[PDB]
Amino acid sequence: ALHFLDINATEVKKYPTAIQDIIINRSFDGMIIRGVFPRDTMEQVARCLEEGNDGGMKSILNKNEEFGTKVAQIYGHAIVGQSPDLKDYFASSAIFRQACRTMFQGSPDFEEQVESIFHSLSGLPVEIPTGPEGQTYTPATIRLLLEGREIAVHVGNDFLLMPAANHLKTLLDLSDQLSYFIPLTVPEAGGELVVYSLEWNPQEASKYAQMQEYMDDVEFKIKSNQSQSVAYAPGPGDMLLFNGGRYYHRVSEVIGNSPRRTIGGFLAFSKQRDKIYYWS
Ligand SMILES: [C-]#[N+][C@@H]1[C@@H]2c3c([nH]c4ccccc34)C(C)(C)[C@H]2CC[C@@]1(C)CC
Ligand SMILES: O=C(O)CCC(=O)C(=O)O
Ligand SMILES: [Cl-]
Ligand SMILES: [Fe+2]
């Protein structure tokens, strides 16, 4: 039901309004972009993490043990669930950027390459957002899914309703936010991005007595009947760029000894629509 383009990284400049067309015009819902990073680069970065020679990335690993099976471990603080002051977020974000820059060894640089893609798909300048007093946001977090683990169903636009987003809302236009991620390592089986046709609907959610009741309905609505879905398994160095702000989605259980490792985040238009911000 959902329409995705499947293109190679070298063809991106032939789609100079792809981000506009996904968010504003809504003519299609996502993109696989093949070979944004070389496989050598992906394996180099995977080894750094595995070895511990990771530019200090393991010093900002959040295991999320208090939460259950339905959640990845995350290198760097994800903005989702943070307090609106973002002090811990800004500290870990500064560490992430430096550590990630070192691991990629400018071959190519993660930030430069990801920004190159987003520029090519929009014709606009691209920036990592900056805090109230100049503090850097993080462009991405690295998500680690071990065997048996998954990422529970969720929708991206709920972020706008969180305290964490109070600063970003001053900078962002309130159109849909996209999700992006590149696998560093893929598992033997499972760990697929499942995108459903069930859409974000805060109007419906407020009619319930609380969000607890609304997500319980959404969960039973999605498993498994009244919603079409599509699954994706990008390879190492492929970007999956899609409207996760609008569409409910999840990552299926990882099967096998090899963990799923992705580097990713989100993007959206600036208030003025003359710029793209990306972050995690
Ligand atoms: C995993 N993960 C992220 C989100 C996340 C969730 N629950 C968490 C609990 C504690 C820390 C993070 C999360 C949900 C299921 C909303 C996850 C959505 C996607 C993330 C990888 C990043 C925003
Ligand atoms: O696999 C990942 O890194 C995140 C998947 C996801 O929920 C998203 O891209 O929004
Ligand atoms: Cl999302
Ligand atoms: Fe998501």
Side-chain angles (χ1 to χ4, degrees), residues 6 57 80 88 99 152 158 195 197-198 207-208 212 215 253:
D6 192 345
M57 192 67 74
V80 167
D88 289 356
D158 284 348
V195 189
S197 55
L198 186 58
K207 299 162 75 195
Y208 288 71
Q212 202 75 56
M215 266 295 291
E253 184 181 314

PDB file of all heavy atoms in Angstrom, residues 6 57 80 88 99 152 158 195 197-198 207-208 212 215 253:
ATOM      1  N   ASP A   6      13.199   2.905  -4.800  1.00  0.00           N
ATOM      2  CA  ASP A   6      14.445   2.200  -4.532  1.00  0.00           C
ATOM      3  C   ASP A   6      15.481   2.691  -5.537  1.00  0.00           C
ATOM      4  O   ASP A   6      15.419   2.348  -6.719  1.00  0.00           O
ATOM      5  CB  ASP A   6      14.243   0.685  -4.648  1.00  0.00           C
ATOM      6  CG  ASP A   6      15.419  -0.113  -4.103  1.00  0.00           C
ATOM      7  OD1 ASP A   6      16.507   0.468  -3.903  1.00  0.00           O
ATOM      8  OD2 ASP A   6      15.251  -1.331  -3.874  1.00  0.00           O
ATOM      9  N   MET A  57      32.670   6.199  22.132  1.00  0.00           N
ATOM     10  CA  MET A  57      31.238   5.989  21.923  1.00  0.00           C
ATOM     11  C   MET A  57      30.592   5.135  23.023  1.00  0.00           C
ATOM     12  O   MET A  57      29.471   5.413  23.447  1.00  0.00           O
ATOM     13  CB  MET A  57      31.005   5.360  20.545  1.00  0.00           C
ATOM     14  CG  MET A  57      29.557   5.340  20.084  1.00  0.00           C
ATOM     15  SD  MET A  57      28.870   6.975  19.758  1.00  0.00           S
ATOM     16  CE  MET A  57      29.665   7.408  18.214  1.00  0.00           C
ATOM     17  N   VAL A  80      14.062  11.725  22.352  1.00  0.00           N
ATOM     18  CA  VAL A  80      12.818  11.147  22.859  1.00  0.00           C
ATOM     19  C   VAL A  80      12.986  10.722  24.324  1.00  0.00           C
ATOM     20  O   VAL A  80      13.902   9.972  24.657  1.00  0.00           O
ATOM     21  CB  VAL A  80      12.375   9.934  22.005  1.00  0.00           C
ATOM     22  CG1 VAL A  80      11.270   9.144  22.698  1.00  0.00           C
ATOM     23  CG2 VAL A  80      11.914  10.395  20.625  1.00  0.00           C
ATOM     24  N   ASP A  88      21.844  16.754  29.751  1.00  0.00           N
ATOM     25  CA  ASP A  88      22.492  15.467  29.525  1.00  0.00           C
ATOM     26  C   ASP A  88      22.552  15.165  28.030  1.00  0.00           C
ATOM     27  O   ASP A  88      23.575  14.692  27.533  1.00  0.00           O
ATOM     28  CB  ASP A  88      21.760  14.342  30.265  1.00  0.00           C
ATOM     29  CG  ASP A  88      21.943  14.415  31.773  1.00  0.00           C
ATOM     30  OD1 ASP A  88      22.697  15.288  32.249  1.00  0.00           O
ATOM     31  OD2 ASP A  88      21.328  13.593  32.487  1.00  0.00           O
ATOM     32  N   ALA A  99      33.164  11.279  18.529  1.00  0.00           N
ATOM     33  CA  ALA A  99      33.423   9.838  18.461  1.00  0.00           C
ATOM     34  C   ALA A  99      33.049   9.250  17.099  1.00  0.00           C
ATOM     35  O   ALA A  99      33.813   8.480  16.515  1.00  0.00           O
ATOM     36  CB  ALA A  99      32.655   9.122  19.563  1.00  0.00           C
ATOM     37  N   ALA A 152       9.522  -1.648  19.574  1.00  0.00           N
ATOM     38  CA  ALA A 152       8.055  -1.661  19.615  1.00  0.00           C
ATOM     39  C   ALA A 152       7.439  -0.655  18.650  1.00  0.00           C
ATOM     40  O   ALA A 152       8.097   0.289  18.210  1.00  0.00           O
ATOM     41  CB  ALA A 152       7.564  -1.385  21.028  1.00  0.00           C
ATOM     42  N   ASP A 158       4.461  11.911  17.485  1.00  0.00           N
ATOM     43  CA  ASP A 158       4.270  11.967  18.941  1.00  0.00           C
ATOM     44  C   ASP A 158       5.396  12.732  19.653  1.00  0.00           C
ATOM     45  O   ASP A 158       5.185  13.265  20.743  1.00  0.00           O
ATOM     46  CB  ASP A 158       4.150  10.556  19.535  1.00  0.00           C
ATOM     47  CG  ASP A 158       2.791   9.912  19.276  1.00  0.00           C
ATOM     48  OD1 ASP A 158       1.844  10.609  18.842  1.00  0.00           O
ATOM     49  OD2 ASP A 158       2.669   8.693  19.519  1.00  0.00           O
ATOM     50  N   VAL A 195       6.572  -0.959   8.147  1.00  0.00           N
ATOM     51  CA  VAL A 195       5.785   0.269   8.078  1.00  0.00           C
ATOM     52  C   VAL A 195       4.323  -0.079   7.820  1.00  0.00           C
ATOM     53  O   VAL A 195       4.007  -0.750   6.839  1.00  0.00           O
ATOM     54  CB  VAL A 195       6.271   1.199   6.947  1.00  0.00           C
ATOM     55  CG1 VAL A 195       5.592   2.562   7.047  1.00  0.00           C
ATOM     56  CG2 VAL A 195       7.784   1.351   6.992  1.00  0.00           C
ATOM     57  N   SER A 197       0.143   1.185   7.366  1.00  0.00           N
ATOM     58  CA  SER A 197      -0.628   2.285   6.781  1.00  0.00           C
ATOM     59  C   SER A 197      -1.414   3.078   7.838  1.00  0.00           C
ATOM     60  O   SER A 197      -1.942   4.148   7.543  1.00  0.00           O
ATOM     61  CB  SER A 197      -1.571   1.762   5.693  1.00  0.00           C
ATOM     62  OG  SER A 197      -2.399   0.729   6.192  1.00  0.00           O
ATOM     63  N   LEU A 198      -1.484   2.559   9.063  1.00  0.00           N
ATOM     64  CA  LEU A 198      -2.143   3.264  10.159  1.00  0.00           C
ATOM     65  C   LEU A 198      -1.398   4.562  10.467  1.00  0.00           C
ATOM     66  O   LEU A 198      -0.191   4.545  10.727  1.00  0.00           O
ATOM     67  CB  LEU A 198      -2.209   2.371  11.400  1.00  0.00           C
ATOM     68  CG  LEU A 198      -2.989   2.890  12.611  1.00  0.00           C
ATOM     69  CD1 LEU A 198      -4.441   3.190  12.266  1.00  0.00           C
ATOM     70  CD2 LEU A 198      -2.902   1.878  13.744  1.00  0.00           C
ATOM     71  N   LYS A 207      -9.600  11.870  22.520  1.00  0.00           N
ATOM     72  CA  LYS A 207     -10.952  11.402  22.843  1.00  0.00           C
ATOM     73  C   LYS A 207     -10.941  10.280  23.885  1.00  0.00           C
ATOM     74  O   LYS A 207     -11.961  10.011  24.519  1.00  0.00           O
ATOM     75  CB  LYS A 207     -11.672  10.933  21.576  1.00  0.00           C
ATOM     76  CG  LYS A 207     -11.834  12.023  20.524  1.00  0.00           C
ATOM     77  CD  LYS A 207     -12.141  11.453  19.150  1.00  0.00           C
ATOM     78  CE  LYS A 207     -13.573  10.966  19.045  1.00  0.00           C
ATOM     79  NZ  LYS A 207     -13.766  10.107  17.845  1.00  0.00           N
ATOM     80  N   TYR A 208      -9.790   9.633  24.055  1.00  0.00           N
ATOM     81  CA  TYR A 208      -9.609   8.611  25.086  1.00  0.00           C
ATOM     82  C   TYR A 208      -9.384   9.272  26.449  1.00  0.00           C
ATOM     83  O   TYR A 208      -9.106  10.472  26.530  1.00  0.00           O
ATOM     84  CB  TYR A 208      -8.428   7.691  24.739  1.00  0.00           C
ATOM     85  CG  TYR A 208      -8.699   6.734  23.589  1.00  0.00           C
ATOM     86  CD1 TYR A 208      -8.810   7.195  22.279  1.00  0.00           C
ATOM     87  CD2 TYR A 208      -8.852   5.369  23.812  1.00  0.00           C
ATOM     88  CE1 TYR A 208      -9.064   6.328  21.226  1.00  0.00           C
ATOM     89  CE2 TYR A 208      -9.101   4.494  22.764  1.00  0.00           C
ATOM     90  CZ  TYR A 208      -9.207   4.979  21.475  1.00  0.00           C
ATOM     91  OH  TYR A 208      -9.457   4.108  20.440  1.00  0.00           O
ATOM     92  N   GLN A 212      -2.568   5.811  27.526  1.00  0.00           N
ATOM     93  CA  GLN A 212      -2.470   4.381  27.822  1.00  0.00           C
ATOM     94  C   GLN A 212      -3.542   3.591  27.070  1.00  0.00           C
ATOM     95  O   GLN A 212      -3.249   2.561  26.459  1.00  0.00           O
ATOM     96  CB  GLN A 212      -2.605   4.132  29.330  1.00  0.00           C
ATOM     97  CG  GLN A 212      -2.009   2.813  29.801  1.00  0.00           C
ATOM     98  CD  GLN A 212      -0.490   2.846  29.848  1.00  0.00           C
ATOM     99  OE1 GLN A 212       0.101   3.704  30.507  1.00  0.00           O
ATOM    100  NE2 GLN A 212       0.151   1.910  29.153  1.00  0.00           N
ATOM    101  N   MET A 215      -2.925   3.809  22.961  1.00  0.00           N
ATOM    102  CA  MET A 215      -1.880   2.922  22.426  1.00  0.00           C
ATOM    103  C   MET A 215      -2.253   1.443  22.547  1.00  0.00           C
ATOM    104  O   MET A 215      -1.845   0.634  21.713  1.00  0.00           O
ATOM    105  CB  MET A 215      -0.517   3.187  23.084  1.00  0.00           C
ATOM    106  CG  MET A 215       0.362   4.163  22.309  1.00  0.00           C
ATOM    107  SD  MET A 215       0.893   3.557  20.686  1.00  0.00           S
ATOM    108  CE  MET A 215       2.014   2.240  21.144  1.00  0.00           C
ATOM    109  N   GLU A 253      11.757  -8.673  15.560  1.00  0.00           N
ATOM    110  CA  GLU A 253      12.729  -9.363  16.405  1.00  0.00           C
ATOM    111  C   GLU A 253      13.987  -9.743  15.621  1.00  0.00           C
ATOM    112  O   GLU A 253      13.898 -10.232  14.498  1.00  0.00           O
ATOM    113  CB  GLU A 253      12.101 -10.622  17.018  1.00  0.00           C
ATOM    114  CG  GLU A 253      13.012 -11.367  17.986  1.00  0.00           C
ATOM    115  CD  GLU A 253      12.374 -12.618  18.560  1.00  0.00           C
ATOM    116  OE1 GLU A 253      11.198 -12.555  18.979  1.00  0.00           O
ATOM    117  OE2 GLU A 253      13.052 -13.670  18.589  1.00  0.00           O
TER     118      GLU A 253
END
